[PDB]
Amino acid sequence: NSVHPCCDPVICEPREGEHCISGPCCENCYFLNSGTICKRARGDGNQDYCTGITPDCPRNRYNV
Amino acid sequence: NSVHPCCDPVICEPREGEHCISGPCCENCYFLNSGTICKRARGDGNQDYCTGITPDCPRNRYNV
């Protein structure tokens, strides 16, 4: 198929000015605001939140 | 010009099986053996060495 629209194929980094390529916490090449819920929990209210600085969805650190 | 031969443009990561894209300590998409000198010093013998796990040339930590 083809180049990811966020990717710069001569560097294998995101195009200059963009943050990221893909991930729960990446949207149109930019990081979602930290605090954005990226996964809800079955229920303690210990939900997983975006960091604002990575594209993944970190496990909430209060989880055992 | 064109895609870096190490780059996978649908992921913006190195092709599967390769380590890296470019850097003093990257060669043909693979990490140089750790211990490989990547820069000599003007002279204490405190040279900079590749790590075996990154493509950059770290400053030797014994440097003030």
CATH number (domain holding residue A49)? 4.10.70.10
Q: Indicate the pairing of strand B48-49 with strand A48-49.
A: unpaired
SS3 call for B26 = strand
CA dist., res. A55 & res. A28, Å (int): 11
Contact between chains at A7 and B12 (C-beta distance less than 8 A): yes
Burial class (CB in 10 A: 0-12, 13-18, 19+), A5: exposed
CA dist., res. A1 & res. A7, Å (int): 14
Could you list the residue range(s) of the whole structural domain that residue A62 is in? 1-64
Resolution, given in Å to one decimal, reads: 2.5
Domain count along chain B: 1
Encoding tokens for residue A23?
A: 């991930």
**Between residues 10 and 39 of chain B, which touch chain A (CB distance below 8 Å)?**
10-14, 21
CA dist., res. A12 & res. B22, Å (int): 10
Q: What is the DSSP string of A14-52?
A: EPTT---S-STTEETTEEPPTT-EEE--SSSS--EE--S
**b (16+ CB within 10 A) / e for B30-46:** ebbeeeeebeeeeeeee
Cβ-proximal residues to A17 (8 Å cutoff; 6+ apart), any chain: none
CA dist., res. B36 & res. B55, Å (int): 12
Q: Does A56 touch chain B (CB under 8 A)?
A: no
CA dist., res. A30 & res. B31, Å (int): 29
CA dist., res. B22 & res. B26, Å (int): 5
Q: Does B1 touch chain A (CB under 8 A)?
A: yes
Running DSSP on this structure, what letter comes out for residue B39?
E
Contact between chains at A9 and B1 (C-beta distance less than 8 A): no
Cβ-contact A21, A6 below 8 angstroms: yes
Q: How far is B37 from chain A (nearest CA, A)?
A: 24
Longest pairwise C-alpha distance within chain A: 45
Q: Bridge-partner residues for A8, per DSSP? A: A13
In the PDB record, what is the listed experimental method? Answer: X-ray
Q: Name the phi and psi angles at B39, rounded to 5.
A: -165, 125
Q: Bridge-partner residues for B14, per DSSP? A: B7
Encoding tokens for residue B13?
A: 């990561």
